[PDB]
Amino acid sequence: VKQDSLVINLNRSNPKLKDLYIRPNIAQKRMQGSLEAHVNGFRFTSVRGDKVDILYNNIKHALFQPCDGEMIIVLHFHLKNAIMFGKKRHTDVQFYTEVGEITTDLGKHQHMHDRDDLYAEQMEREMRHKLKTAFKNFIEKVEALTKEELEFEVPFRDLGFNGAPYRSTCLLQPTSSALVNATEWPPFVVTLDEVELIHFERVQFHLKNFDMVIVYKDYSKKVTMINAIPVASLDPIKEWLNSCDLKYTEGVQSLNWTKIMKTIVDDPEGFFEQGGWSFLEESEIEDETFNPSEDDYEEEEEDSDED
């Protein structure tokens, strides 16, 4: 798919911020660089000179995830059309900056100076402050430059949930017009206004978690199955499901979605001719009701236990 050539303005100084590791890696070695905002798109550069062109209209959702509560701050971009650079074709491209954590040194050669009480958490907090202030300035400046053509989105981390949609378990965070998790690369992105209904699978007597099915308004795309969402996130998701107000239903059986979408694609008329999405909703014979005339004859047998 074609793209648009990026243009540079030397008349005035443009936005700039360095220390962004690109993801995914262009060469197999992980790589760091800098990022600049221009008239028609973002120009990402590095010490090798990788010219990453991210067109503004090519950004569907601008994602940002901060550095308080997570060791890495992420600026994620979802493109309308995937672009090829470094002989690799990518659709989601993020740039992340770290704060600094120890990863080893647990007594095999651990120095005594952890007991020196440096109080380095204050320096860590100031570094967090500097990063978040710089990122705030960058976001406001690019809001000014874009003429409000596109808008970034920051997730609801406080009322998020734990979910395992991919091969790896993670925590999913709703946003204003998307549900995204770019922390665990490969990043997971979905847009809220594109999903017709949500079906929950494996709801029963107390289980640790459940599966959940995301069914799109189109049908040539497979439904997205997010597994491993705890019971503690069951209704809170519903508290968010009524925010953008999208329909949700539950079920116990895991469904054959391959055949569902095949039956949808081959003959679309017959599916709505039978009611549509009407598969989301004897017993006395199978379960006797208590007879309200069976009683214990024995009474006043309490006896006396004295003072």
Partner: protein
């Protein structure tokens, strides 16, 4: 044995128009038996913790406050205290 009648009476107390199926009724008997045995085992252990040869209502209050979470513990010791102040009123 079967404590179905008292459960039917409290059912009439809170929602009189309701009833209950016999399977759910036996499950109710099993649940009440189990929770009674748990609190009774706790009380029999406390009959040896605090060294008293007898079991007073303080021990049952302790068992309720231990086996139950925050809200239910207080909301049950309330009913316990009301009934014991009713019995102490002759």
């Amino acid at each position: 044995e079967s404590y179905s009648i008292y459960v039917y009476k409290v059912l009439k107390q809170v929602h009189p128009d309701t009833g209950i199926s016999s399977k759910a009724m036996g499950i109710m008997n099993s649940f009440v038996n189990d929770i009674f045995e748990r609190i009774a085992g706790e009380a029999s252990r406390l009959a040896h913790y605090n060294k008293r040869s007898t079991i007073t209502s303080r021990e049952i209050q302790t068992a309720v406050r231990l086996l139950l979470p925050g809200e239910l513990a207080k909301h049950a010791v309330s009913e316990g205290t009301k009934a014991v102040t009713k019995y102490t009123s002759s």
